[PDB]
Enzyme design. Structure first.
Site, mmCIF file in Angstrom:
data_model
loop_
_atom_site.group_PDB
_atom_site.id
_atom_site.type_symbol
_atom_site.label_atom_id
_atom_site.label_comp_id
_atom_site.label_asym_id
_atom_site.label_seq_id
_atom_site.Cartn_x
_atom_site.Cartn_y
_atom_site.Cartn_z
ATOM 1 N N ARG A 16 0.271 8.935 1.806
ATOM 2 C CA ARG A 16 -0.167 8.882 3.213
ATOM 3 C C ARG A 16 0.627 7.894 4.059
ATOM 4 O O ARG A 16 0.601 7.993 5.295
ATOM 5 C CB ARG A 16 -1.670 8.570 3.304
ATOM 6 C CG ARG A 16 -2.527 9.820 2.950
ATOM 7 C CD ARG A 16 -3.914 9.709 3.521
ATOM 8 N NE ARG A 16 -3.843 9.711 4.979
ATOM 9 C CZ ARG A 16 -3.913 10.808 5.720
ATOM 10 N NH1 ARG A 16 -4.182 11.989 5.178
ATOM 11 N NH2 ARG A 16 -3.702 10.718 7.031
ATOM 12 N N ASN A 17 1.335 6.955 3.436
ATOM 13 C CA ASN A 17 2.198 6.004 4.126
ATOM 14 C C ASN A 17 3.670 6.386 4.051
ATOM 15 O O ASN A 17 4.545 5.529 4.219
ATOM 16 C CB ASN A 17 1.976 4.601 3.540
ATOM 17 C CG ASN A 17 0.750 3.927 4.141
ATOM 18 O OD1 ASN A 17 0.444 4.148 5.298
ATOM 19 N ND2 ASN A 17 0.044 3.116 3.358
ATOM 20 N N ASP B 226 0.844 -1.200 0.000
ATOM 21 C CA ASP B 226 0.000 0.000 0.000
ATOM 22 C C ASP B 226 0.875 1.244 0.000
ATOM 23 O O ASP B 226 0.706 2.158 0.813
ATOM 24 C CB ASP B 226 -0.958 -0.034 1.187
ATOM 25 C CG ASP B 226 -2.033 1.064 1.126
ATOM 26 O OD1 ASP B 226 -2.404 1.595 0.026
ATOM 27 O OD2 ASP B 226 -2.490 1.395 2.245
ATOM 28 N N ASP C 126 4.417 1.621 7.733
ATOM 29 C CA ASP C 126 3.481 0.509 7.575
ATOM 30 C C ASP C 126 4.012 -0.556 6.618
ATOM 31 O O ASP C 126 3.225 -1.265 5.986
ATOM 32 C CB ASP C 126 2.107 0.968 7.090
ATOM 33 C CG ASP C 126 1.310 1.589 8.222
ATOM 34 O OD1 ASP C 126 1.666 1.298 9.392
ATOM 35 O OD2 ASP C 126 0.322 2.289 7.978
#
Ligand SMILES: *CCC(=O)Nc1ccc2c(-c3cccc4ncc(-c5cnn(CCN6CCOCC6)c5)nc34)cn(C)c2c1
Length: 309
Positions: free
Chosen positions: A172-173, A168, A186
């Site tokens: 945002r990560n 992913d 993450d």
């Protein structure tokens, strides 16, 4: 007395275990997958300097956590140990498994996730959407932007070398530290053994299907090659200073469009060369995408040629 003793066997690793009285808990950093994330000051985190304080991020387990939540947070922590340290990932710093609730201690990235960091740095004018920050910050140079991409690629190159598939990879990560270092987050999360809901938003309103390579969309196949596809989307996010992918496209139409060859248009402020890199990342055929090794080498060259004026 047994009050507050975990019913479970939480793993104590003497190399990493920190007494929780060495943590001075501070401001909330928001709700994570397994519980609150909190800024803390850690005393004596480096056993060589027992009297110094380091700012850290503390991942906690929510009070109503399930056994699966607990197992998942332990698994992320042990995965970070096996993956080892890199400048461009969020690194493990310690853990509190004894004398209270489980804490996993990781590096603190004071400027938060890359999407909102870039959005707050949008200049006015035609090339970007408006700046939503009431505390806007100085605009980045063209070289800063390419350097952001280089740093993420370097972190992914390391993770791929350790056989870690992110699944992913999105702005945002990626978190940004006080010194503007990009750090992938993450990456240590175990993969869900259940099928996922493509139309369920994250708690921050994101639809992760927009970062999925077509073979992940269609057949749930995730490889380093599908992370390269996601990196292409992340590149588009960087050069739109935090844009939302596939503007106006309903998510249930996305695979059909990708299959027919639809790809995002070039951002207004983006060189032809970096757009060609995005498109290469979005090759339909996984084997034909560049590797992260190649992306790092190419971005290194582009950073050096890109003006910071
Ligand atoms: C289940 C998926 C999920 O919830 N993932 C998740 C991953 C990491 C998270 C953090 C986090 C982790 C590690 C370090 C870290 N450092 C800082 C921050 C942070 C959060 N908000 N800020 C402040 C941002 N503003 C920006 C404007 O100017 C002032 C600062 C910093 N977060 C982390 C936290 N969460 C909730 C995570 C979730």
């Amino acid at each position: 007395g047994p009050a507050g003793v975990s019913e479970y066997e939480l793993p104590e690793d003497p190399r990493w275990e920190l007494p929780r009285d060495r943590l001075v808990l501070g401001k909330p950093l928001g709700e994570g997958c397994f519980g609150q994330v909190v800024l803390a000051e850690a005393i004596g985190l480096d056993k060589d300097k027992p009297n110094r304080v380091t700012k850290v991020a503390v991942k906690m387990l929510k009070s109503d956590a399930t056994e699966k939540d607990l197992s998942d947070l332990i698994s992320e922590m042990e995965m970070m140990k096996m993956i080892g340290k890199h400048k461009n990932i969020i690194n493990l710093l310690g853990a509190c498994t004894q004398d209270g609730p489980l804490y996993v201690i990781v590096e603190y990235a004071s400027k938060g996730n890359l999407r909102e960091y870039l959005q707050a740095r949008r200049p006015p004018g035609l090339e970007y959407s408006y700046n939503p920050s009431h505390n806007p910050e100085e605009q980045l140079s063209s070289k800063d932007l390419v350097s952001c991409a280089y740093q993420v690629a370097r972190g992914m190159e390391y993770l791929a070398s350790k056989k870690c598939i992110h699944r992913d990879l999105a702005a945002r990560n990626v978190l940004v530290t006080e010194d503007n270092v990009m750090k992938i987050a993450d990456f240590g999360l175990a993969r869900d053994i259940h099928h996922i809901d493509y139309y369920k938003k994250t708690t921050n309103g994101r639809l992760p299907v927009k970062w999925m390579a077509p073979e992940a969309l269609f057949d749930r196949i995730y490889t380093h090659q599908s992370d390269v596809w996601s990196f292409g989307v992340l590149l588009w996010e960087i050069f739109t200073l935090g844009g939302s992918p596939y503007p106006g496209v309903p998510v249930e139409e996305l695979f059909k469009l990708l299959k027919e060859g639809h790809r995002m248009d070039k951002p207004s402020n983006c060189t032809n060369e970096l757009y060609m890199m995005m498109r290469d990342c979005w090759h339909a055929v996984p084997s034909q995408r560049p590797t992260f090794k190649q992306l790092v080498e190419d971005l290194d060259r582009i950073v050096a040629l890109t003006s910071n004026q």
